[PDB]
Nucleic acid binder design. Sequence first.
RNA 1: AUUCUGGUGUCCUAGGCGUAGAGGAACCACACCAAUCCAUCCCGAACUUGGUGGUUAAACUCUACUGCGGUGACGAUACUGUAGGGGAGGUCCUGCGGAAAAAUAGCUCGACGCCAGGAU
RNA 2: GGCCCUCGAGUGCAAAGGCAGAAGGGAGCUUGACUGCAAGACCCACCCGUCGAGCAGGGACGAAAGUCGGCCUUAGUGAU
Lengths: 135, 60, 179, 49, 118
Amino acid sequence: MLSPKRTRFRKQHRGRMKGISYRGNRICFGRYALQALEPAWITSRQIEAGRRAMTRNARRGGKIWVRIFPDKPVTVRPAETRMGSGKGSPEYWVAVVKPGRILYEISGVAENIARRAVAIAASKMPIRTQFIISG
Amino acid sequence: DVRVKVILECTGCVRKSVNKGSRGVSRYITQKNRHNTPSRLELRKFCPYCYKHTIHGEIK
Amino acid sequence: INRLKTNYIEKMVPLLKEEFSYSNILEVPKVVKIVVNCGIGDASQNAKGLDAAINELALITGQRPVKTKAKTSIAGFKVREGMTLGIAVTLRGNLMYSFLDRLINLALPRTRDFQGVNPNSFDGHGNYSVGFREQSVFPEIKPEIVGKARGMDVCITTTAKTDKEAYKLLSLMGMPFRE
Amino acid sequence: GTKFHPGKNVGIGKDHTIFALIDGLVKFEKYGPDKKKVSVYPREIQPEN
Amino acid sequence: RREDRTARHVRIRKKVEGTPERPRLCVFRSNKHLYVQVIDDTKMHTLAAASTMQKAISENIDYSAGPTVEVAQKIGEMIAKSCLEKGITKVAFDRGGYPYHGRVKALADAAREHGLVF
RNA sequence: AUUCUGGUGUCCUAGGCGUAGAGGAACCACACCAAUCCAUCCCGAACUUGGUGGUUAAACUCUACUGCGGUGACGAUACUGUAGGGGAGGUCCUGCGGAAAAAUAGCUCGACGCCAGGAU
RNA sequence: GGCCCUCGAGUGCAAAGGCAGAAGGGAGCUUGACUGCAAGACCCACCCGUCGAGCAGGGACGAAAGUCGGCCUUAGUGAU
């Protein structure tokens, strides 16, 4: 659960997810990487669960990197309660991901195995991801 | 009863009366801290009945 | 006139021109001021021994120190001053050179276990300080009449640059070094 | 506060309110290092056809 | 020493120059050779000038270059002499970055007593 | 009429630093002393006063290079005015019109006005 | 005490906007925290609020030009 450490303010707005993610398009560390297509609000439970499942299929060697970190909070109001009377406490933290953004990077395994691994990591996530080789 | 408005009269135009152009004490009400400046204020100021620029004595 | 100051301007002016090879005489490294600091902590409470310490240093030369005050202690009081600390002289001119060389002759024989001052103890850009654990090094002090034994230091402020220039300046001045 | 600063022909008040002293058109000049001025200039001839 | 003195000039100038109709008397001072000049309202040109660098009274003056009380007293009449020749009564006397004490004050004294009341 | 040095602006980082060199005939600055004018919360460091016997070293002024700082396109792209369209999945696509920021090419080591004094 | 970025400090009290030889820090002298007003604007349903060139008198400070009718600005308040 990749939670932020004491941010400025507690609760904040929803905004929205216009535009393509331009910056997190490039690959730094890995040679293979998982990249997003549809925008979504990706919880830390979804990140961690992707990272675990991808790690399980690394096996002999090869290092994995995450490139998305949540930051934004989301509040669900006290369960079964009428409208109004302030906001609720933040339950979970989410990464606003837009189209064409890197989620996971990986290097140092055979292209056989990396592709197998990212299938599982794709299956754990809520969005239509895709595999990208470049580095 | 800690910081108080106070009654700066004049020592110039002390209370006189008769002869149409009546004297009529000028006055200024303004604030001082009672604790800070325990001795009474004694500022110089304009008084439109004196026509000068008198000493404005403090009282109560 | 002091034995340093008369010999300094006559003999000691063109001497350091040989080593460093300067253009003009004025740029040949020299002393601008001496600052005799004495930063006391407990003298905020009671400053009678501190007043005595003022008289101690003024009766060496004639020139007196200034009563130092702190940057920020603990007070709301904005219109008037904060918490006092200690004393500091600012020496210049003839009296500067007087106090400078007669410190080395009259005062330094009184300090025991004194091989000398540290040679590699400069700031970098040609300035220096020397610290003494007692302010009873001077000839005038007597250890029974003083209120409190409170040490001190002396800052030598020169127009120098390299670390070889300050050490050689002190050598020409006449200071008993270490190593 | 003084976002804009007072220029020529122009008063500046107790609240940093900037008001014109004379007739004429308003001018927002460039002050030097990253600030703004305001001066006022009357205009010579104004023709009507 | 000179570094700090331009600050002293700018502080006074930016306060002095701000209000219009400025026939200002600008005095200078130096280790050698003392100078002074009067400047336009719009700050374009200068109306009347005087100095120990100038040829008239520099040959009449005794001291080498001319920063002293005597020569300044002489200049204080000559600077007020040119102004009334031009036809300018009141001016705005400027320090120019020097504390108002000795030579500048002596200059002001002869400037006042001449007829040039500023 | 032209060029310097000293004073005053318009113009404010195409105008600022660094590096490298150069200037004392003048002007400008550092070194001499301080009864007195006057001064130091101490100190002629500074302010001030009286003198000159040194110097272009520091500052200041002037000539260079782009090392930095600064400014900075064209093209595209994001975005958006207006007229439409696709998706239930939450935003996307089109015509018509405006158009960044960033990045880079490249541009810069001031310009220009008046006055005082010197030189052609 | 020296060096180096230089305004990230401070600005009685929350924040925002401001403030360099300064609106920030120190000293000298004082009381414009003054009477009589006021062209003209801003803000608005009304009630209310806000800025004010300038003139008149009588002062303050300065050599002078000038600056001063409270506070660096926006809260510290109630009609009849």
